[PDB]
């Protein structure tokens, strides 16, 4: 579904990887090129040794994975941050 790949707006990678999958999905097409498209859409480190490719394994890759960053920790509303100072009228 599109909910894992929304329209990026600033002025998707998985959509482009699926487009490179469907660009080889023809009857006169080898299983090796479709297999390579499926692999580099799912996990590029199976056939390569490069990082920074946004694939599926990016949500479970290291410290910056999805659970550690957005599930057991999050950015919140009704928050504030400021320098501290002492007070003698404050117990």
Partner 1 sequence: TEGDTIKISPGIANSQNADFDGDEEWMILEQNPKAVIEQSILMYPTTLLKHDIHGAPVYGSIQDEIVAAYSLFRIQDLCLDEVLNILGKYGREFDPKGKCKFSGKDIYTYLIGEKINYPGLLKDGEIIANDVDSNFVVAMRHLSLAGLLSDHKSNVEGINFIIKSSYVFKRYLSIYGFGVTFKDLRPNSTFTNKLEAINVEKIELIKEAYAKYLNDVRDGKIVPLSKALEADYVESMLSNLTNLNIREIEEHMRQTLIDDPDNNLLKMAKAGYKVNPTELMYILGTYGQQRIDGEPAETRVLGRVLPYYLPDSKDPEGRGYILNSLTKGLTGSQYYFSMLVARSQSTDIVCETSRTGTLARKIIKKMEDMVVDGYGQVVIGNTLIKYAANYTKILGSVCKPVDLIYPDESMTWYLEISALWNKIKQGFVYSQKQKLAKKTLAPFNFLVFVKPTTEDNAIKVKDLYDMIHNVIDDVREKYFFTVSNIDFMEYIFLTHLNPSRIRITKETAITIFEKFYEKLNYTLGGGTPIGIISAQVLSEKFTQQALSSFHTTEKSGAVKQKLGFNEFNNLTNLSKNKTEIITLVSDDISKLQSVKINFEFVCLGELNPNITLRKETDKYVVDIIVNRLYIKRAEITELVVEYMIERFISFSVIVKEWGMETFIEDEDNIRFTVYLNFVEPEELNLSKFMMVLPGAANKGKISKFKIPISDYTGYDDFNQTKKLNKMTVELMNLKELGSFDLENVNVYPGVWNTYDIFGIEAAREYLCEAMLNTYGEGFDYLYQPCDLLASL
Partner 2 sequence: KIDTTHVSKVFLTQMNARGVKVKLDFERRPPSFYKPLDKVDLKPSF
Partner 3 sequence: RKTISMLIEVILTAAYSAKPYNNKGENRPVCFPSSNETSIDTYMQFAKQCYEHSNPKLSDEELSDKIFCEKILYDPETDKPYASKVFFGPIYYLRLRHLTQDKATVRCRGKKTKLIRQANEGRKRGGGIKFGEMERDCLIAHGAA
Partner RNA sequence: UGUCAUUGG
* From 31, 75, 82, 90, residue interacting with DNA (rule: CB under 7 A): 75
Closest approach, Cβ 59 to partner 1, in A, equals 19
Closest approach, Cβ 35 to RNA, in A, equals 28
What six digits make up the tokens of 77?
Answer: 């509303």
Sign of CA dihedral 27, 30, 33, 36: positive
* From 2, 7, 73, 84, residue interacting with DNA (rule: CB under 7 A): 73
Sorted by sequence, the CB contacts under 8 Å of residue 39 that are 6+ apart come out as: 46, 47
Whether 37 and 20 have beta carbons less than 8 Å apart is answered as yes
Stretch that binds partner 3, among 21-29, 30-38, 50-58, 78-86 (CB under 8 A): 78-86
């Amino acid at each position: 579904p599109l909910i894992i790949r929304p329209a990026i707006s600033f002025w998707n990678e998985l959509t482009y990887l699926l487009g490179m999958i469907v660009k080889n999905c023809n009857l006169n097409a080898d299983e090796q090129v479709i297999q390579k498209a499926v692999i580099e859409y799912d996990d590029i480190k199976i056939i390569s040794n490069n990082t920074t490719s946004i694939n599926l394994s990016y949500i479970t890759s290291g410290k910056n994975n999805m659970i550690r960053s957005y599930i057991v920790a999050r950015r919140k509303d009704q928050t504030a941050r400021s320098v501290i100072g002492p007070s003698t009228s404050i117990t």
